[PDB]
Design a protein around this nucleic acid. Structure first.
Lengths: 264, 264
RNA sequence: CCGAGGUGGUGGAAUUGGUAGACACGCUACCUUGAGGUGGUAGUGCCCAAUAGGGCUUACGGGUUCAAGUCCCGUCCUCGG
RNA sequence: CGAGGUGGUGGAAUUGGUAGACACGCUACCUUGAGGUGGUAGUGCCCCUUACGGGUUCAAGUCCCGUCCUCG
């Protein structure tokens, strides 16, 4: 019985979910994704994440791969599966791949985007899709300040109390801070990440644009190698896993990342 | 006991509501808005809309005015209010006004935007915020075709069947069709609108960009003065009342319309 | 003696009246698991008989107001030289 | 030179995707303009369902078989 390994571009809205990692007592994208992915392959399927996102953490460039004997047409994995998927979780594409591929271990780099709503008043539309921030922000200071995190560094100061990896070291590829309308977007990328790194970078990074801290403060915290010094972690309520990287050899479809209108 | 008349910029998400219209035994923005607007002024408040929005029709430039004796600072109408408001419905600003003002009648022109998702696969993020469309669209044909509805016309063909009087005539200011990413936005404006006017224009307008109809077809339907001949209506599931107009004399705050990131 | 200050078990917050304890650590039991930590769920306060849905809680009783840890009046305090 | 049988009607459903969208009628419960129009909710079983039985698939208004029809 020949087996098949295919990849899927999962895009979801953790608005109403407790993270990706399946549970027992609560809702988890995975659980669902599998629940339906299997209902297709007609054989208990189990999928592999590529970035075990947190709880209430939206995703649009999430990638997963699962093995299966079931030989579907192609529209199946697509419409087929989405067909049994709750409106908040859907597929974007599918592409068979070689055993050498592994949505989590074949990844070369992952990328996130954070959407901050910078207005004194709460927002309605996409309420659970963006983070609220009254205090005025400065996209320039933030960007500037946040330019020392570039390169291989010891994000200890920015890593969550507990974790899993061994080292607090990571290589940040790019980290640009922009502003579209009253919205401030944080775009970042790095080989891999440490627990809550992004929800922390921003966290503090927010302080700088609010002049509640100087610009150097960032590099200061970093060099300080100490978590308890930097602003509190930010509300996952706006972290979007916009894109992951894989070797060109595997060749995976690259659609938009947004989210929504935001250009690539 | 002196009375006060103030205006509010209500922004909501009809995702989970039965439309703007106040109802009994159901959820309606109004009901809520009042429910809370009053809690503050501490005297059964009743508001006046400026554009009765159908069911599941988002709004961001919605304007309403209500009278009240209650002399609240201005933190109430802006914050105090929202505080008693469900995440999907919030205020954006408030500005006292003269009796001569009336959110619905003082209006000189109203404007909407329609967001179409043009991808063969369903979308997750903002699931109830955008209309899903499989077959490929042509932003150019659509735009082109949709250029004869400009000016005073007899939108009979485009008006929701029931009617007898108060004319099928309307003056369309501008109607441009664009495309941002796999998203297709329809932006339109006119002195006022006829029942479903927009949800129909698009409706058909969708057909043209799908080459399921020629370009002239639009002007044909229009001139044909007949509902049954134009493609069915369009899902309210993406109609956003982005903005309304009022005389400069009243002077009302003009923030962004979007929705979301979409620029003005 | 005039002035500082009193928020859970801790560290540590609260758009400058808006409507609590954000972020984190530490423990009680629970879940996955096999008990590798990690990850989730409830507590870690007080009542309403339990049930239940909820309600009261920011040193303690009063007041102001549509709304108060946040303004005001005092009660017990905890200090600064 | 033509071919069919989805609710009270018309009349649509991606590539076999997971049902009646849209519009008319019909009954409710509301409902300001101020010339009186509008909102929402209901409109196939009973305490599963697209003439009705089959077959194939993870998947069936949608392909194959049948049965009774509608038709040129």
């Amino acid at each position: 019985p020949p087996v098949y390994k295919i990849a899927l571009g999962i895009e979801y809205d953790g608005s109403k979910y407790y993270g990706w990692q399946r549970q027992n007592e609560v809702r988890s994208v995975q659980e669902k994704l599998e629940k339906a992915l299997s209902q297709v392959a007609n054989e208990p399927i189990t999928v592999f994440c590529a970035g075990r996102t947190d709880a209430g953490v939206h995703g649009t460039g999430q990638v997963v791969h699962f093995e299966t004997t079931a030989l579907r047409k192609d529209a199946a994995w697509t419409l087929g599966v989405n067909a049994n998927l709750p409106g908040d979780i859907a597929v974007r594409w599918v592409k068979t791949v070689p055993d050498d591929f592994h949505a989590r271990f074949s990844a070369t780099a992952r990328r996130y985007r954070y959407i901050i709503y910078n207005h004194r008043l709460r927002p309605a539309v996409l309420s659970k899709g963006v983070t609220h921030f009254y205090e005025p922000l400065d996209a320039e200071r933030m960007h500037r300040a946040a330019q020392c995190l570039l390169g291989e560094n010891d994000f200890t100061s920015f890593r969550a109390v507990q974790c899993q990896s061994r080292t607090p070291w990571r290589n940040v590829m790019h980290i640009n801070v922009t502003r579209h309308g009253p919205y401030v977007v944080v775009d970042i990328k790095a080989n891999a990440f440490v627990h809550h790194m992004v929800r922390n970078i921003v966290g503090s990074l927010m302080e700088v644009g609010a002049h509640n801290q100087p610009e150097s403060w960032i590099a200061e915290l970093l060099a300080a190698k100490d978590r308890t010094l930097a602003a509190a972690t930010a509300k996952a309520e706006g972290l979007y896993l916009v894109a992951v990287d894989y070797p060109d050899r595997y060749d995976l479809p690259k659609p938009p990342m947004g989210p929504l209108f935001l250009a690539d």
